[PDB]
Each structure stands twice: as C-alpha cells, then as structure tokens.
C-alpha cells in the first residue's frame, strides 16, 4: 500500500516551507538564491541524488533510488532541527519538518524492505553533527541555512519527480 500521492503532498508542503525560508533569509539577510550567494567554503556532506543511485528515467530502479531517498530524508531531521532554530520564529511550520521528513523516510523505508530482502535500518540521528551545526556562531549560521536549504530543495524536488514516475 505505497501511498505516493500522500508522500507527494508532504514533499510539496516541505518544498513550500523550504521556499519560505529562502525568501525569509533573503529578506532579513540579503543572501538570495542566485543574486548574492555566500562567499564561503561548502564543507559538509549533504544528501544528494547521484547517478550511482540510478534515479533518472534511464537506468532507473526503485531498489537503489528509494534507498537514497529514505536515507536522505532521515538525514534531514538533524538539518531541520538546525533550521527550526534559525527560522522557527519567522516561518510557519518549519518546526514540524523534522517529523515530516522522518515520515517520508519511514514510509519509503517500508517500500524498500518490501522491494528487497536486504533489511534496512533508518540511519543514526547524528547528534555530533547537530552539535557542530548548532555550534556555528553569528553570520555564518545563515550560510549553513543557505546550503542546507539548497540541498533540501534539490533533493525534495527530485523525490517528487521520482515518486511521480514510479507506476
């Protein structure tokens, strides 16, 4: 009972909040998508669909891809916690994204186990990362916000694509 439509409503809600953070960040900060991005060193692994995940129309396969989508969505909770601290006071519903994303991981992680026999386990909530992320101080925290938001926008956007293309 794979509820793709419902997962898509979650991805779009998530995309909506994401967009609202960019707009809010751009408004109070000046750091805007493609107009004035940070001059800083990208330095943290962020979930991203590779070709090794075989998720595009050619060479596709739920197996490898759902695995990435689920893994990424679980990895997003730590990021959304950092985001909640940064946008919670100015963006409606950022505070529940850490739960929503766990929800996408769970439901997607349920498909995998049904699709394979390799039994999958939702990754470890990285407290160490949260600690480092929540450890950034002053201006640079907006940079983290910008990069995190960018990575989530791309991923979530791709997830919607992937889910709409599975029959």
């Amino acid at each position: 009972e794979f509820e793709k439509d419902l997962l898509i409503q979650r991805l779009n809600w998530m995309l909506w909040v994401i967009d609202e953070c960019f707009r809010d960040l751009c408004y109070r900060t000046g750091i805007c998508k493609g107009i004035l991005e940070p001059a800083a060193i990208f330095h943290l692994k962020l979930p991203a669909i590779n070709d090794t995940d075989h998720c595009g129309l050619i060479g596709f396969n739920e197996t490898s891809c759902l695995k990435k989508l689920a893994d990424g969505f679980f990895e997003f909770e730590v990021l959304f916690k950092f985001l909640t601290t940064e946008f919670g006071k100015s963006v409606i519903n950022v505070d529940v994204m850490e739960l929503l994303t766990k929800t996408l991981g769970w439901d997607i992680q349920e498909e995998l186990n049904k699709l394979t026999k390799t039994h999958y386990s939702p990754p470890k909530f990285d407290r160490g990362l949260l600690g480092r992320l929540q450890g950034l101080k002053y201006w640079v925290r907006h940079f983290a916000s910008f990069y995190v938001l960018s990575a989530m926008e791309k991923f979530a956007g791709q997830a919607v694509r992937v889910l709409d293309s599975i029959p």
Partner: peptide
Amino acid sequence: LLDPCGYISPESP
C-alpha cells in the same frame, strides 16, 4: 568545518 571568506568587526554591536 563549514567556513567563511571573511568577517566584520566588531561582531554584533
């Protein structure tokens, strides 16, 4: 380390 090109001083006056 997730780090910058420069900074403004003083920090947050």
